[PDB]
Design a protein around this ligand. Structure first.
Ligand code: 1RU
Length: 273
């Protein structure tokens, strides 16, 4: 009854299953058109699982912000598996874009990307939402180069499966090199642990998509961080911005900035650059 505003109609969605764009563990992503909106469509067994899927769809549908990727709707089909419909992001993920050599953002542009992610995250935080996997690969770019925080809720997956590693006991693939210390220990995530991930994302931006800790093995990162060791300041990263990243990696989660504070500080840095 209350899901009607989330559910997409009978002949209102056209999906192109021949042309694929994404490969998540929980499903593949295709091109689509929604009546005219260009979409990305992810295809995802029983009534209890469907109902859960609907319920969280209603919850996620009311997340609205220019720096957060929106859910356009859902299209459950009696014959097939449910389809999650999202707006098509012309310039793909933020990591591949800043690695794409045919493009050439400035340092200023790269700082403006980080400012936008902080705004998107500032919004998510205010709704008590914890992302759990904030990273350049999960932030998308539209035709205007507006950055949209993404890969949370219904379309939550691991698409680039290279940067996810299994903790043996729990049996869950985690992005350890984007994870706060206390999250590696306790396996528990908070908005303050998103702030950690945001510091890493900034490092990604300033290095133009370089992988974090290439010389530290996935099973050594906890010890590495325990020892006080942190990512180096990138060559073209301004000092005040490195000071910001270091505050994000504070051993105590309590002492890390908020996303509100970060929007304020990066916007100051952006304005003087
Ligand atoms: C679920 C899926 O959503 C997408 C959304 N919402 N928008 C665009 C894409 C593309 C994609 C794949 N290629 N391109 C462009 C990149 C620039 N050259 C033309 C093609 C875009 C792949 O996936 C897209 C996705 C994927 Cl696969 C990975 C990370 C994400 F955050 C999201 Cl949100």
């Amino acid at each position: 009854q209350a899901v009607q505003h989330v559910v997409i109609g009978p002949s209102s969605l056209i999906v192109h299953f021949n042309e694929v764009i994404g490969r998540g563990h929980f499903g593949c992503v295709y091109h689509g058109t929604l009546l005219k909106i260009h979409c990305a469509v992810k295809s995802l067994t029983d009534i209890g699982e469907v109902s859960q899927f609907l319920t969280e769809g209603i919850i996620m549908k009311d997340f609205s912000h220019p720096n957060v990727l929106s859910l356009l709707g859902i299209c459950l089909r009696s014959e097939g598996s449910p389809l999650v419909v999202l707006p098509y992001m012309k310039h793909g993920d933020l990591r591949n874009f800043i690695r794409n050599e045919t493009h050439n953002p400035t340092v200023k542009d790269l700082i403006g990307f980080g400012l936008q992610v902080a705004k998107g995250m500032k919004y998510l935080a205010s709704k008590k939402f914890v992302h759990r996997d904030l990273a350049a690969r999960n932030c998308m770019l539209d035709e205007k180069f507006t950055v949209k925080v993404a890969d949370f809720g219904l379309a939550r997956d691991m698409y680039d499966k290279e940067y996810y590693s299994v903790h043996n006991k729990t049996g869950a693939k985690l992005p350890v090199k984007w994870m706060a210390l206390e999250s590696l220990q306790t396996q528990k995530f908070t908005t303050k642990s998103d702030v950690w991930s945001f510091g890493v994302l900034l490092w990604e931006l300033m290095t133009r998509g370089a992988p974090p800790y290439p010389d530290v093995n996935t099973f050594d990162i906890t010890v590495y961080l325990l020892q006080g060791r942190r990512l180096l300041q990138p060559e073209y990263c301004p000092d005040p911005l490195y000071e910001v990243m270091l505050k994000c990696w504070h051993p105590k989660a309590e002492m890390r900035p908020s996303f509100s504070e970060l929007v304020s500080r990066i916007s100051a840095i952006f304005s003087t650059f």
